[PDB]
Nucleic acid binder design. Structure first.
Lengths: 429, 429, 54
DNA sequence: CAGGCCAAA
DNA sequence: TCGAA
DNA sequence: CAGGCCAAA
DNA sequence: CAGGCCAAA
DNA sequence: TCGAA
């Protein structure tokens, strides 16, 4: 029996794209200094311990694609970032022969040079560190004396501007040449900071534990023997990272009266649940299903997130748990490792009258070549004969939305709770 | 590249302790007699069938550790009971040559001697038996004629007092010498009882099924050939049995404003759910998440259970489902098997005028040597530099609590529902 | 001098405070390994008239 | 043929 | 990895 | 290429 | 010894 | 098959 027709299925076309960048980063060797941070609003008073390792923003999309590539990627609905990779190699670390001070400087040819690398500090439940930018002192450029007012969003925007230049019509175009074009370096200014409670104003019982021994969670290498060596090599397969909303399916409300019918889910959890926790132990953890969310494509689409391009540099690529699909699915929380690299401050040769850490430090700079690759995928269904692409109903996607209309997304700038990332409302640019 | 520092992690010290005891138990061979139990409150009128197998309280902590060991175990936070083991061996069973009656007793050298063993009766959905203490008749000491007023808590307290003696300052110190010191025996007085509905007062439709054939679920051996033989050998690995609350973690509320932030749990169930069922079929089963519970260590700790030592002899060791952890976890209901051993009553040689069971029974006693071992573990984190031990945030533990403040715990004394244990409020000592 | 004969050289205050809770604690052994890195010598002192940097 | 049902394995 | 295989 | 989606396996 | 905890594997 | 083995 000859078969004139066979179930060939749909005509689905899948596209794959890869993006490569190479960056050169200069990080200063900040001293380990305790700084007092005043209480403000929900933030209590806390002591802050600065550290010299600068963070590598490999969790954001601008780190991988240029504005032109992002603008063209906007034209392919259903774009999912499948994988990312980053390799950090280190070059010769530079240490000043002698500081600006001359009376007691004792310039030296010999030098001790150590490189610190951290990979999982952000996910450690008890460290509760975060990324901050400091304001250095005039006499000791390696000694932080406060915190800059630049937020994480502003820091990443400035870094992207340094990477890709301005527009040709901008008056400040001559200030920052495109690093992607020139191959120059980009000074990194965001460094890790450990935190501990400030018990001076505490009334009643006090916690006097001090800082945790965070040095036990970082690698340290002799920078003299690390010249031209691979220091970091990380790969990350994204669980769910929709960069462009899927194609809008043909609504079944215009065809069938059955569109609102229910069907049994059984014991399987078809709807994602949001978990609220209280680290102050004043309230037990709560899990809530049917969280406020709405579709990101279709008749009642709310594309605020993608229109705002929050995923470019304001929100990380990895967004598992945030986005739900109507397909029978399983969803788990996802987060990315945090890469921190930097040179330890070199103590000055001058003597110290009492047993304590170094009082002055030599200027130092590390040289890091970062090679990053991002691989994505796209889908075009061609479900219907006419009217362009339409996707299947089971591919409909919803995003968590606040009661005030702002979408909810992951952020990696806030310290973790229970070794977990935190969902927060996106802020309009 | 030489590594001066490496990620050695935390300094966590783990301690393991084991407790061994050997007990000698004497159990009487009660007759199988139907007793009428009157209705009281929620309890309906029911017929009760006594059985001669005494229960072995291997699910309680006093069975394994002495008061001194328990008092010292209180000093190791994070004490989890990892395993338990019990071996029961039987010695020569004793049967009276002739009872107090002399007119019709017919003393005999020959004797039939049978030993009954039951292991899973408590978990059988339809038997609905329970452990009870009887009040014997004067003429027939092997024939129960009612129920004693001693509850399970009182019976276990008396058994513990018999095992470990009184305090040296107590006036009753000379009454009960410590069995753990002397090696003497301990008369067991708690025996199994089958139940069935009493249809005499029932109005309308009636269930006239009678007693279930519980003899099909018990082993029976010839006690003559069992002299000095291992009868029972049971091992039990505890799923979750916290004996001392974990070390209080450093609260993140004193450090970060992020402590109250939420994070997506996905389709995974991070919060344990309580299930309420109705065997009367007047209401469908209900599953409720976010059950009332509160932390057992930390700033807002409620240590009522452990302060009351309910886990010593009032509440079983196994408490799965009751205790929740903030760590990403999976929880399932847990229960322990019930060991019942005892000699069957020996009918008197006197003849019976009609076809029925024995009217009088010879006195009998079984001799059981019980060897029990309990293995536990402990953890000391040393997370922070100063101020003693502090645990990680993800190790925070919550316990179910009633709306009136009494904690909720498992009890094995009540009959099962749907082959499942029942949660009930603990009672203050 | 290397103060390797004292207890603070080995245990932090938290470890010492918890060790206080175990009666009968006997220190059975101690070990110390000292490794040396590059020694630093000044190119020239504060004096400049007769210093002869080398 | 005992541990969240047994007539399921 | 709330038995454990 | 049929059974809780298929463009997943 | 980095990805939803580590003192679990 | 919201990493992936």
């Amino acid at each position: 029996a000859t078969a004139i027709l066979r179930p060939i299925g749909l005509h689905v076309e899948k596209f794959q794209q890869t993006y490569r960048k190479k960056w050169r980063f200069l990080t200063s060797a900040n001293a380990n200094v305790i700084l007092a941070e005043a209480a403000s609003g929900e933030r209590p008073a806390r002591w802050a311990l600065t550290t010299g390792m600068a963070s590598i923003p490999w969790e954001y999309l601008f780190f991988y694609m240029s504005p032109a590539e992002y603008n063209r990627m906007k034209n392919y609905p259903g774009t999912f970032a499948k994988s990312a990779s980053v390799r950090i190699r280190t070059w010769n670390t530079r240490v000043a022969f002698q500081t600006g001070d001359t009376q007691t400087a004792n310039a030296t040819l010999n030098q001790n040079k150590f490189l610190q690398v951290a990979k999982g500090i952000r996910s450690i439940p008890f460290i509760c560190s975060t990324n901050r930018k400091y304001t250095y002192s005039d006499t000791e450029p390696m000694q932080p004396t406060g915190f800059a007012t630049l937020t994480s969003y502003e820091y990443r925007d400035g870094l992207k501007t340094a990477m890709y230049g301005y527009d040709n019509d901008n008056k400040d175009f001559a200030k920052k040449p495109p690093a992607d074009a020139t191959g120059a370096e980009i000074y990194l200014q965001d460094y890790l900071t450990i935190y501990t409670n400030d018990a001076r104003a505490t009334t009643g019982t006090k916690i006097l534990a001090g800082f945790p021994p965070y040095k036990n969670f970082i690698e340290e290498f002799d920078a003299s023997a690390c010249i031209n060596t691979d220091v970091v090599a990380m790969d990350y397969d994204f669980s769910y990272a929709p960069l462009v909303p899927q194609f809008a399916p043909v609504p079944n409300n215009l065809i069938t009266q059955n569109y609102n019918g229910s069907y049994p889910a059984g014991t399987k959890n078809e709807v994602t649940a949001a978990k609220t926790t209280d680290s102050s132990q004043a309230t037990a953890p709560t899990q809530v299903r049917n969280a406020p969310r709405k579709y990101i494509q279709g008749p009642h689409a709310d594309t605020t997130f993608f229109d705002e391009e929050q995923n470019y540099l304001r929100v990380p690529i990895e967004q598992g748990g945030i986005f739900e699909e109507v397909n029978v699915e399983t969803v788990h929380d996802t987060q990315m490792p945090s890469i921190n690299v930097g040179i330890r401050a070199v103590p000055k040769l001058t003597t110290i009258d009492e047993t304590t850490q170094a009082n002055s430090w030599l200027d130092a700079q590390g040289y890091f070549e970062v090679d990053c690759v991002l691989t994505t995928e796209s889908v075009d269904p061609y479900t219907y004969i006419k009217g362009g692409c339409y996707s299947a109903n089971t591919k409909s996607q919803l995003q968590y939305f606040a009661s005030d209309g702002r979408p909810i997304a992951k952020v990696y700038d806030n310290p973790n709770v229970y070794g977990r990332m935190q969902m927060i409302k996106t802020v309009k640019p």
